[PDB]
């Protein structure tokens, strides 16, 4: 499943730890 | 409203923003543009290992993305970064 752009997902969202 | 003092280590025309869960990114407030690379910092050298330039500052954590691209987690503004805290600031 695509989240954003074709393949431009480098830094994982914040939450003290890499939260999906 | 309007306030000034110290820049957040970013070029002109751009503004740092965060995605829903706190993902730091660079947007062009002018054209509502969204890019991962920081203008002020070079293109080739974006994901740098500050460990060679200087220790990580307060409120930060170094990590690697699936592609093996390291990033950082700043607990000051509660977000995840792509470009180093010192990179943009040189």
Tell me which residue of B37, B36, B30 sits closest to B14, measured CA to CA.
Answer: B30
Torsion of CA B58, A18, A16, B51, to 10 degrees: -10
Structural biology method used:
NMR
Q: Which residues of B touch A17 (CB under 8 A)?
A: 73
Is B79 an 8 Å CB contact of chain A?
yes
Tell me if B65 and A12 make a contact (CB, 8 A cut-off). Answer: yes
Backbone angles phi, psi at A7, to 5 degrees: -155, 50
For residues B74 and B16, the answer to whether their CB atoms sit within 8 Å is no
Q: Can you tell me whether residue B34 is helix, strand or coil?
A: strand
The total number of structural domains in chain B stands at 2
Q: Which CATH number does the domain housing residue B32 bear?
A: 2.20.70.10
| Residue B11 in tokens | 């070029």
Is residue B1 one of the residues assigned to a domain? no
Backbone angles phi, psi at B59, to 5 degrees: 60, 60
Residue from B20, B37, B80 to probe the interface with A (highest A Cβ count within 10 Å) = B80
| Residue B50 in tokens | 């500050």
Where in the sequence is the domain holding B20, given as residue range(s)?
10-39
Is B22 an 8 Å CB contact of chain A?
yes
Cross-strand bridge partners of residue A13: none
Tell me which residue of B27, B24, B25 sits closest to B60, measured CA to CA.
Answer: B24
Q: Indicate if B34 and B50 belong to the same structural domain.
A: no
């Amino acid at each position: 499943g695509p989240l954003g752009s074709e393949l431009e997902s480098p830094p994982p969202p914040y939450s003290r730890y890499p939260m999906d | 409203g309007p306030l000034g003092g110290s820049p957040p280590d970013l070029p002109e025309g751009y503004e740092q923003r965060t995605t829903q869960q706190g993902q730091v990114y660079f947007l062009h407030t002018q054209t509502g543009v969204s890019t991962w690379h920081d203008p002020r910092v070079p293109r080739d050298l974006s994901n740098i290992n500050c460990e060679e330039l200087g220790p990580l500052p307060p409120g930060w954590e170094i990590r690697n993305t699936a592609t093996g691209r390291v990033y950082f987690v700043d607990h000051n503004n509660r977000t995840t970064q792509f470009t180093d805290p010192r990179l943009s600031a040189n």
